C-alpha cells in the first residue's frame, strides 16, 4: 500500500469530500452557511487550483523546448523517424475518436463568428508578445457601428506558448552543440519545476477533498452525477475498445497484410500486466520479451522502439483526456466550437507525449488541457474518482500501440 499511496489518498479524499458535502447540505447547507462561510469552505481547493495554474508555464515551456531540441536525426535514423510519425498519427486518431464519441454519446449532457474564431486561433498560435502570452490571449468582440474589434484579454495563451517552445527547441536542435547551454538551462529548470510539482501533489488530497465537498454542497441532485460519471466511463472504455480492437489492427493489417490478432495473442500477457499494474514501465520488460520471442521482432527494433514508446506513445491517455475535456465541457454547459476542439486535440497530443507512464499519469496533462480551453479544472475531482478504472484501460492501449508499431517496423525491415 506504500506504493500507489497517493492514488489511494485521492480516492479517500473524494469519499471524504462527498461525505462532507452531504453532511453540510443536510445539516444546513449553502443557504445556512452564507457566502462568508461558503467562500472560506472551498478555499483549500482554490489554493490547489492556483498552485496547479502557477506551475503550468515553466513546465510546458521547458519540457517542450527539451523535447524539440532532442530530435537528433542521427539518433533516430529512418526507423525512429518512422516510429515517431506512427506515434503522432495514432495519438491524433485516438484523440479524434475520443472527441467524436464524447460528442455523439453526450456523457455530460442532462457568440463569435466562424471566421473570427479561426482568425483568433491563428493570432493566438503566433502571439505578438511572449511576455503577454504568459497571462493574456487575443480575443475578438464586435461593435455595432457588427465590425470585429480584437484585443488581449485575461487568460494564459497556452497554445501560443506551446508553439513558441516547440519552435525554439527546433532552433536549439539546429544549433546543436552551440545551443548546449540553453538546452541544459531549460532541462534543469524543468527538473526544479518537477520537484515543485511533486510537492504540490502531496498537498493535492486536501484541496481535492474540499473541492469535492464544495461541488456536492452546490449540487441539488447528487444521484444524477453518478448517472453521468458512469456514462463518462463508458465513453472512455468504448473508445479504448475501438482504438485497440479496430483502428490499430486495421493500420497494422493495411501496412503488413498479416493478422493483427495473432500479434495481440502473442502480447496478451504483457497486456494483462499493463491492466493489473496500470504502469507502462512495469510491463515494458515483459513486452520486449514477448514481442521478441512470440512475435519474432528483432532486438535492435524492440530494444530501441518499445522503450521510447513506453514513455512517448500514449493513445489511451489521449483518448481519455479528450473524452474528459468534452465531458467537463458538457457538465459546465459550455459550448465547444471547432477552435476549442482543435485546441483540445493539439494540447492533448502534446500532453499525451508528455504524460508519465505511471498510474494516474494523465491527470496533470488533463488540467493543462482544460486550462488551454478555459474549462473548469475543479471538475477534475470527478474524473479522478474513477481514474483507478479508466487508467488501466489507458495503460493497455498505451502499450499495445508500441507493440504494433514495433511489429510494423519489423515487417518493413523483413520486406527490405
Amino acid at each position, epitope marked *: 500500500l506504500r506504493a500507489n499511496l497517493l492514488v489511494l489518498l485521492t480516492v479517500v479524499a473524494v469519499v471524504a469530500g462527498v461525505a462532507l458535502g452531504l453532511g453540510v447540505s443536510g445539516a444546513g447547507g449553502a443557504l445556512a452557511l452564507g457566502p462568508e462561510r461558503l467562500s472560506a469552505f472551498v478555499f483549500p481547493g482554490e489554493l490547489l487550483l492556483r498552485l496547479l495554474r502557477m506551475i503550468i508555464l515553466p513546465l510546458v515551456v521547458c519540457s517542450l523546448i*527539451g*523535447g524539440a*531540441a*532532442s*530530435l*537528433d*536525426p*542521427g*539518433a*533516430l*535514423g529512418r*526507423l*525512429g523517424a518512422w516510429a*515517431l510519425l506512427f506515434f503522432l498519427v495514432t495519438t491524433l486518431l485516438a484523440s479524434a475518436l475520443g472527441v467524436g464519441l464524447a460528442l455523439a454519446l453526450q456523457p455530460g449532457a442532462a457568440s463569435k463568428e466562424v471566421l473570427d474564431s479561426f482568425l483568433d486561433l491563428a493570432r493566438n498560435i503566433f502571439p505578438s508578445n511572449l511576455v503577454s502570452a504568459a497571462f493574456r490571449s487575443y480575443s475578438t468582440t464586435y461593435e455595432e457601428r457588427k465590425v470585429p474589434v480584437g484585443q488581449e484579454v485575461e487568460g494564459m495563451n497556452i497554445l501560443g506558448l506551446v508553439v513558441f517552445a516547440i519552435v525554439f527547441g527546433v532552433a536549439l*536542435r539546429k544549433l*546543436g*552543440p552551440e545551443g*548546449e547551454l540553453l*538546452i541544459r538551462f531549460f*532541462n*534543469s529548470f524543468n*527538473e526544479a519545476t518537477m520537484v515543485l510539482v511533486s510537492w504540490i501533489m502531496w498537498y493535492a488530497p486536501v484541496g481535492i477533498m474540499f473541492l469535492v465537498a464544495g461541488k456536492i454542497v452546490e449540487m441539488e441532485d447528487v444521484g444524477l452525477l453518478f448517472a453521468r460519471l458512469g456514462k463518462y466511463i463508458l465513453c472512455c472504455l468504448l473508445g479504448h475498445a475501438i482504438h485497440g480492437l479496430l483502428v490499430l489492427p486495421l493500420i497494422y493489417f493495411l501496412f503488413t497484410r498479416k493478422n493483427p490478432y495473432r500479434f495481440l495473442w502473442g502480447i496478451v500477457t504483457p497486456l494483462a500486466t499493463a491492466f493489473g499494474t496500470s504502469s507502462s514501465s512495469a510491463t515494458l520488460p515483459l513486452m520486449m520479451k514477448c514481442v521478441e520471442e512470440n512475435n519474432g521482432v528483432a*532486438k*535492435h*527494433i*524492440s*530494444r*530501441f522502439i518499445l*522503450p*521510447i514508446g513506453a*514513455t*512517448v506513445n500514449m493513445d489511451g491517455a489521449a483518448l481519455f483526456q479528450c473524452v474528459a475535456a468534452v465531458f467537463i465541457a458538457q457538465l459546465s454547459q459550455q459550448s465547444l466550437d471547432f477552435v476549442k476542439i482543435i485546441t483540445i486535440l493539439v494540447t492533448a497530443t502534446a500532453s499525451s*507525449v508528455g504524460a508519465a507512464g505511471i498510474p494516474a499519469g494523465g491527470v496533470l496533462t488533463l488540467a493543462i488541457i482544460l486550462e488551454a480551453v478555459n474549462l473548469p479544472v475543479d471538475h477534475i475531482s470527478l474524473i479522478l474518482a474513477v481514474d483507478w478504472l479508466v487508467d488501466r484501460s489507458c495503460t493497455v492501449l498505451n502499450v499495445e500501440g508500441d507493440a504494433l508499431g514495433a511489429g510494423l517496423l519489423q515487417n518493413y525491415v523483413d520486406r527490405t
Partner: nanobody
Amino acid sequence: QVQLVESGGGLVQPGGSLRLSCAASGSIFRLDAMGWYRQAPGKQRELVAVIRSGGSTDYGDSVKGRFTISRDNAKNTVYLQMNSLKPEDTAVYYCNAVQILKTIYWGQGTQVTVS
C-alpha cells in the same frame, strides 16, 4: 543529469589511427543513442557515427568502412575507432547522448588534426 567526458583527440599522421572515447556519467532515465558528429572549418556539422540501444549503428558516408563505433555496456561509454585517417578527417568532434523527446547532451568537442 549527464556529464560527458571526451578523450582521445589530437594530432595524427595520414593513414594513422585514433580512438575517441565519450563517457556519460550521472543519471539519465533512458539513453536511446550515443554518437559523434564533426564540424570541419567552414562547413556544417556532419554525422560521424551513432550507436543506439538495441545495437543498431549508423555511420557518415565519408567514414563508412574506416570508422567503427562500439559500446562498453558496463560503464555507458562509447568508443570511436578511426582507421586510415585522411586530411579530410581534420575537424572538431562532438559526442552526444540523447533521450529522444526528453533532452540531448553535447560534448565540448575534441580537435582532430590529420597532417
